[PDB]
Amino acid sequence: GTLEKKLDNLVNTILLKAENQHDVKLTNTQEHILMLLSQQRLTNTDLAKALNISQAAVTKAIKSLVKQDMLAGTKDTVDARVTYFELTELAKPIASEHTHHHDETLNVYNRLLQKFSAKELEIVDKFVTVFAEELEG
Amino acid sequence: GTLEKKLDNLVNTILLKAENQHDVKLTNTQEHILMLLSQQRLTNTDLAKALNISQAAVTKAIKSLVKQDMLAGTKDTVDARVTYFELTELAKPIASEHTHHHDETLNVYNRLLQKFSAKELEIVDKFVTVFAEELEG
Ligand SMILES: [Zn+2]
Numbered sequence: 316g317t318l319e320k321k322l323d324n325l326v327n328t329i330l331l332k333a334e335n336q337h338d339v340k341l342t343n344t345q346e347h348i349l350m351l352l353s354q355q356r357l358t359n360t361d362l363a364k365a366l367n368i369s370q371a372a373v374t375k376a377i378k379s380l381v382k383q384d385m386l387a388g389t390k391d392t393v394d395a396r397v398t399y400f401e402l403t404e405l406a407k408p409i410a411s412e413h414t415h416h417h418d419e420t421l422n423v424y425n426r427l428l429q430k431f432s433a434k435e436l437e438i439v440d441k442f443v444t445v446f447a448e449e450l451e452g
Numbered sequence: 453g454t455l456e457k458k459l460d461n462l463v464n465t466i467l468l469k470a471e472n473q474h475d476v477k478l479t480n481t482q483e484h485i486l487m488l489l490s491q492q493r494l495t496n497t498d499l500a501k502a503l504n505i506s507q508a509a510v511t512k513a514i515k516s517l518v519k520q521d522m523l524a525g526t527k528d529t530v531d532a533r534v535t536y537f538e539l540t541e542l543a544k545p546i547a548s549e550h551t552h553h554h555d556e557t558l559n560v561y562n563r564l565l566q567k568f569s570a571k572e573l574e575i576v577d578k579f580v581t582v583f584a585e586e587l588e589g
């Protein structure tokens with residue numbers, strides 16, 4: 316079959332795996348907010364930029380997180396327009412675990428990349444780079 | 453940064469895009485069931501095999517679809533153990549649209565692939581192939 320189709324299938328298997336094997340029910344957006352907040356305080360707008368999604372998608376994910384006692388907001392003392400989010404105690408084990416599953420998957424990607432010569436990997440780089448640009452938009 | 457990390461980011465941007473831009477709220481699993489059923493009647497077990505997810509994930513997605521008047525089941529007349537699913541009238545426009553968005557994304561993948569020589573594309577093939585195997589498990 317075409318490479319177009321294998322890419323289509325690659326995207327589908329990522330989507331299907333994430334819905335199938337993995338009392339909070341966090342979305343990936345919310346887990347990746349918690350990931351980024353676990354290493355520094357950030358604003359709604361830093362989060363939106365870092366994840367490349369709308370500010371309104373971030374505001375929505377943060378409201379649901381605050382509702383589940385996962386985050387707490389505190390305003391900045393020099394500029395009251397600015398709110399910083401940080402993890403509550405209850406979120407920290409949830410975040411750590413998600414971070415640890417990312418760490419394990421990085422080894423999976425290492426092993427797979429290892430099958431390519433370093434020549435091959437410049438092309439793999441070039442491919443993942445353009446693909447990611449495209450899938451962003 | 454490492455290629456490991458770009459792959460990790462590639463997976464995240466797929467997950468984040470699917471949650472962010474896109475009264476039914478269908479999952480990808482359910483849309484891909486409807487996609488496969490729109491071209492032939494199939495069983496729970498053909499669907500599970502074709503999508504590579506558990507039979508129990510399929511049974512779950514099909515119950516919710518039947519509940520939303522999207523599918524109807526009819527048993528096989530030679531073997532009563534066997535149930536075939538097919539789309540109700542109401543599902544057909546929903547399915548067509550999802551199928552048409554897949555068709556458009558195939559052009560997106562074509563354009564991106566076009567930037568590689570055919571030499572480069574053997575390596576891209578080799579990469580997407582092993583990656584997909586891995587991400588399946
Ligand atoms: Zn994640």
Ligand SMILES: [Zn+2]
Nearest residue numbers: 480483484550
């Ligand atoms: Zn789809």
